[PDB]
Amino acid sequence: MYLTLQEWNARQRRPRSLETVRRWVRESRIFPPPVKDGREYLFHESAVKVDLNRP
Amino acid sequence: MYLTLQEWNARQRRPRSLETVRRWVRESRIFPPPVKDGREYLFHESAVKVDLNR
Amino acid sequence: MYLTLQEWNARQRRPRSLETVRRWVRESRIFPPPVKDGREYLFHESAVKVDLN
Amino acid sequence: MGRRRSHERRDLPPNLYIRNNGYYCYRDPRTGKEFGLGRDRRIAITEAIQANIELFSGHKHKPLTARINSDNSVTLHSWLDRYEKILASRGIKQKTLINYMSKIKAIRRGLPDAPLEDITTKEIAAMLNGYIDEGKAASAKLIRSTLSDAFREAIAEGHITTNHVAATRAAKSEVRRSRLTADEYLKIYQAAESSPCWLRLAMELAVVTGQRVGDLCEMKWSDIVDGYLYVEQSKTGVKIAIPTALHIDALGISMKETLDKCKEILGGETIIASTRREPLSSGTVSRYFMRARKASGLSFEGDPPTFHELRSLSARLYEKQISDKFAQHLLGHKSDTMASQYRDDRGREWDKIEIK
Amino acid sequence: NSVTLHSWLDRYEKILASRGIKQKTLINYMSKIKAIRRGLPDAPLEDITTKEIAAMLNGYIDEGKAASAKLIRSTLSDAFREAIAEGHITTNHVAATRAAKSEVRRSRLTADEYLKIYQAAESSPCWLRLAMELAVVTGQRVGDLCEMKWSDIVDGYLYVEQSKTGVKIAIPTALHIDALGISMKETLDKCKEILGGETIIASTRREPLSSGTVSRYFMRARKASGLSFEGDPPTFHELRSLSARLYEKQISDKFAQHLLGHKSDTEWDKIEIK
Amino acid sequence: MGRRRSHERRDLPPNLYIRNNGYYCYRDPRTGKEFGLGRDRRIAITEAIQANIELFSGHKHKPLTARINSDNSVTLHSWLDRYEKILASRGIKQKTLINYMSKIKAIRRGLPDAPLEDITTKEIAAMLNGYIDEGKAASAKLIRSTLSDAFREAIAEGHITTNHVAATRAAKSEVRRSRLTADEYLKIYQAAESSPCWLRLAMELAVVTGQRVGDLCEMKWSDIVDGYLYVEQSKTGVKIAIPTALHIDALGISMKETLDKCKEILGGETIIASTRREPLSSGTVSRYFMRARKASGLSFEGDPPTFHELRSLSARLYEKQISDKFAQHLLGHKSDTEWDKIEIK
């Protein structure tokens, strides 16, 4: 089962903007990264945003 | 079940200023840490304060 | 859920000075006893001034 | 002490300190020594804080709406360790004991380290229901039962006086293991050509004898005398003798004909051996049976059947073939409760009624 | 704090709403909870004594409603058992009581009685008679008899999906009761000519009917016939009981069980020579 | 007292205990000792004031809640003494009484001598398990059952109120005594050559009649009418009459031939006598049967079979020779209470 860009963001702790979610995908802030299918992205069921930074 | 910084401060013994709430997170005075998700912390349903001293 | 020192004494019949009320706290003259938040005390809405002896 | 507080521990938990090298080390309240863990600040403190799940060290606890009743006692995580020392003396088979340990291990990573008269019924329900929301309902039932008998033996040793676990209910499973028809049987046997030869022989032998996959890999060519098949089940312990004259017309499989095939092609000490002329495990037989299932392409509703389902299909066939009492003694089963709960369909085939 | 009985009964209903059960089933329990409301004061659970619980229970037993007391006692007990799970109280003062044993007083139906009711159903519409013969020839429950569509019949069969249990069976259109003079086939075709609708049993307006009106009008023809019984007059559901009782002596017992929709087994036996 | 009043006590929480290094330690009014409470001033006092006042209820017309006041009782040993007296009047076999007193002596050397209202469930379990780890599993089951019965009768009188023994669990053990075969009996029968003559006759007569060794020693020749064998079982009291016509075709031993061999060789009032032509005890017939076991040179898995196994062997032979209803109608069995050939049926 693979959720879409909107469906995935509609299940997070706090729904954000479509363009915002698109930014994480480009910043690899989505583990695991979505898969390209057609024109939209397909995220994983247990997909959750992470922070690739160690201050 | 995870809540926001605003929703969490609403369910405490005494609601304080948002500034003070952010301070506790930075000073690591809550088990477990909120963990920044984007640009807004996400408290855990069991994340309570601890308070230190010297 | 709780009430501040002023919000509790203001509801009393004979609102005494802040100091005097703070003294009934250290002398456990208030039961149920109040808890210390940060700099102020937040009593219970049912907390009464139990005058004994 | 020499150093009560400092400007270094001021940002560190009670355990764990910081050396003159910017490194951190966590003390040990069992010897007074410590190990170096971490180079960063928010890492050593965020590491020496979950062991710190047990500051009892000050703080007490209280939820929303509750009562009070306590005094003093000891830990409990240790009781789970003493409970295992009692189960090993109850005289249990070497397979059931492992089933208990796995559950006790789940209780370890489920409930917080806590005394025994502290873990309220509400805390046990939060962990129990957590497995239900995941779908694993059959697990919550065993975890509850095990965690229930643990406290029972605890009360009998002067530690607890009540059994909070008996307050909460147990999940009710529905068994979503789809059955296997006679038509889907040939569909799998036909796709079992890519798989070894012992698979098809043991697949038919498991439907002609209606035995367990475990005892199916325990039969030797010495257990056959005067045309009988002496089989000793290990699960229950029942002993039966299967005649080598059986036959299933619904699938066209003869008992004797199937036996001989395992004597020429296979060959060995056991009825069902491997290509290396050696006995296989009970987990490898049903393993390859899966491959032919997925390779088939057929679809079901719920959870795909299994090699053990062959035992069920064997019973349903023998029913209409000969009689009902026949598909009861062969399965090494007695009583009168499962004989009916093994003939059902469970939402698959309509129970058609005929003029008879 | 936050205690009290009523306050809990409100947080208890939501719990049963997530149990995942039938609609009508959830309603049955609610009616029992409301009875407890006006049956016991509004005070903490730890204050409720076993005496007050039995005082209300027995009050419904003397009124004649002993059956209701059993469910109310079995439901009120579940509430407390779930209350302890939350940590509200420590004991269930309901497990100390005793449920009143009630005996079924709903008389059965015979062959002679049925014939007297069918003829008395003349004043009634033209679908009741069809519903009677059908409920006795199929031996099905009134609940599913109303949800039967002509699309269910497939090549001489009658696919019926029981709502209560959920059993799936297929009654062939070849059955016939040899005691009243009714034929499955002749009965079905009689419904296609007279009624004429999407469902086997419809109204005069060619539209499906509720299961509460099928047994309702049957009652009118019951009291209109002028037949006396012992206890409580049989109902439309009794046609199901009469159906099996007839098929057991018409064909076989293993047939009646398969017709009703049963799976497991659960008067004047004969002492054979051997 | 020595201190009465002083500083560091002017904090006010009773049972206080502020030591030199600023460390509170609540005292217990049961031993006098105390445990380290806390290192704060307004924290330890709170954990000491809540103890003084015993709360439970919440707003009511004068509650109750009891948790004190108690006296008048008896001691374990003392009560265990009269307990034996009550058992002697219960009306039972003398042998049964001995097996109960044997468990009583075990309790004496297993539990202290303090008021019966002080024995905790823990103490009882500590003694019970002490016999479980020693391999004496079956023993900790009889002692536990007897101990629990001594408390219930104690409550009946009015001594105590609760049976703390009804909280523990009784261990479940598995039989260890092995089963005798038909090939091992022949071997032992040959190893019994070094033993007296009555041993051989006792063995055969214990497998052909399937009677208890205790009753086998009480068999008189007067209990043989025409072609029967009246034997009044002493265990339960079941009356039976074994006909002099049976014979084991698995060992080649006829009951008639066996009886006659006991009339010439032995010679006495009892079918099974000694060389002195006099009745022998039941503990002597089995003791010498053992001498043949270790002499035969046959090892078993666990505990070596006894003379009683001859009975079990007698039943397992007749069960295949004639019928099953026959075996149950020989050993003295009343009601019902290794491979079943599953034919095409």
From Swiss-Prot, chain A:
GO terms for biological process: DNA recombination; provirus excision. Keywords: DNA recombination, DNA-binding, Viral genome excision. Signal peptide: none annotated. It comes from the Viruses. One of its GO terms (molecular function) is DNA binding. Interacts (via C-terminus) with the integrase (via N-terminus). Part of the excision complex made of the integrase tetramer, IHF, Fis and Xis. Part of the excision complex necessary for the excision of prophage from the host genome by site-specific recombination at the att site. This is Excisionase. The chain holds residues 1 to 55 of 72 of the full protein.
Curated annotation (Swiss-Prot), chain B:
GO terms for biological process: DNA recombination; provirus excision. It comes from Escherichia phage lambda. Keywords: DNA recombination, DNA-binding, Viral genome excision. This is Excisionase. It comes from the Viruses. The chain holds residues 1 to 54 of 72 of the full protein. Part of the excision complex necessary for the excision of prophage from the host genome by site-specific recombination at the att site. The keyword Nucleotide-binding does not apply. Interacts (via C-terminus) with the integrase (via N-terminus). Part of the excision complex made of the integrase tetramer, IHF, Fis and Xis. One of its GO terms (molecular function) is identical protein binding.
Curated annotation (Swiss-Prot), chain C:
Keywords: DNA recombination, DNA-binding, Viral genome excision. The keyword Metal-binding does not apply. GO terms for molecular function: DNA binding; identical protein binding. GO terms for biological process: DNA recombination; provirus excision. The keyword DNA-binding applies. It comes from the Viruses. Interacts (via C-terminus) with the integrase (via N-terminus). Part of the excision complex made of the integrase tetramer, IHF, Fis and Xis. Part of the excision complex necessary for the excision of prophage from the host genome by site-specific recombination at the att site. This is Excisionase. It comes from Escherichia phage lambda (Bacteriophage lambda). The lineage of its organism: Viruses, Duplodnaviria, Heunggongvirae, Uroviricota, Caudoviricetes. The gene is xis. The chain holds residues 1 to 53 of 72 of the full protein.
UniProtKB/Swiss-Prot annotation, chain F:
The keyword Magnesium does not apply. It comes from the Viruses. InterPro entries: CB (IPR044068), DNA-bd_dom_sf (IPR016177), DNA_brk_join_enz (IPR011010), Integrase-like_cat_sf (IPR013762), Integrase_catalytic (IPR002104), Integrase_lambda-typ_DNA-bd_N (IPR015094), Integrase_recombinase_N (IPR010998), Integrase_SAM-like_N (IPR004107). Belongs to the 'phage' integrase family. GO terms for biological process: DNA integration; DNA recombination; establishment of integrated proviral latency; provirus excision; symbiont entry into host cell; viral genome integration into host DNA. Residues 74-155 form the Core-binding (CB) domain. Integrase is necessary for integration of the phage into the host genome by site-specific recombination. In conjunction with excisionase, integrase is also necessary for excision of the prophage from the host genome. Its EC number is 2.7.7.-, 3.1.-.-. This is Integrase. Coiled coil: none annotated. PANTHER family: PROPHAGE INTEGRASE, PROPHAGE INTEGRASE INTS-RELATED. Pfam families: Arm-DNA-bind_1 (PF09003), Phage_int_SAM_1 (PF02899), Phage_integrase (PF00589). GO terms for molecular function: DNA binding; hydrolase activity; integrase activity; transferase activity. It comes from Escherichia phage lambda. The keyword S-adenosyl-L-methionine does not apply. Transmembrane segments: none annotated. Residues 175-344 form the Tyr recombinase domain. Changing residue 47 to A: Complete loss of interaction with the integrase. The active site is at residues 212, 235, 308, 311, 333. Homotetramer. Interacts (via N-terminus) with the excisionase (via C-terminus). Part of the excision complex made of the integrase tetramer, IHF, Fis and Xis.
